[PDB]
Design a protein around this ligand. Structure first.
Ligand SMILES: [Mg+2]
Length: 173
């Protein structure tokens, strides 16, 4: 029916212990991402600011109203905070092999870029991303999946070598 585009406003959602949740962030404090179970969800809103071939991404690190192709690297701006969904440098509590995921105060480097990949055989690289598709998000910097799981039953969010499927839902009409 409909295709993901740059400048679109979205929530990222997954199923955590049966429940539906969205990837949320605050913009102050530690700025670590977190999950809110689903006007009253503003911190769960990201803007797809840029999408590029990884060739272009690597070119730039040394757009428009454009449609997302699987394999694209995308730049996700947190609306409230004007910051960017990023892979952090510090390691996750309860998995030494994961990285924390939070907000980075600027849009520089690779830690704020995520490649998009099919969460099923029903799609292949280079195809248009459809609203409603389930996504796999791989950090460009640390080659880990944006991933969600629990520790002492508390759904946490990190970048690790285990995969989560995310569903990109549009915000607003
Ligand atoms: Mg900005």
């Amino acid at each position: 029916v409909s295709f993901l585009r740059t400048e679109d406003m979205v929530c990222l959602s997954c199923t955590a212990t049966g429940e539906r949740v969205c990837l949320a962030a605050e913009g102050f404090g530690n700025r670590h991402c977190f999950l809110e179970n689903i006007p009253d969800l503003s911190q769960c809103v990201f803007v797809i600011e840029q999408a590029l071939s990884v060739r272009a991404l690597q070119e730039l690190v040394t757009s428009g109203h454009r449609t997302l192709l699987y394999g694209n690297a995308i730049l996700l701006r947190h609306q409230n905070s004007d910051m960017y969904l990023a892979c952090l440098s510090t390691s996750s509590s309860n998995d030494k092999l994961a990285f924390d995921v939070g907000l980075q105060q600027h849009s520089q480097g690779e830690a704020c870029w995520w490649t998009v990949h099919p969460a099923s055989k029903q799609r292949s690289e280079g195809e248009k991303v459809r609203v409603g598709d389930d996504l796999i998000l791989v950090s460009v910097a640390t080659e880990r999946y944006l991933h969600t799981t629990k520790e002492n039953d508390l759904s946490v969010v990190n970048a690790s070598f285990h995969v989560t499927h995310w569903s990109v839902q549009p915000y607003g009409t």
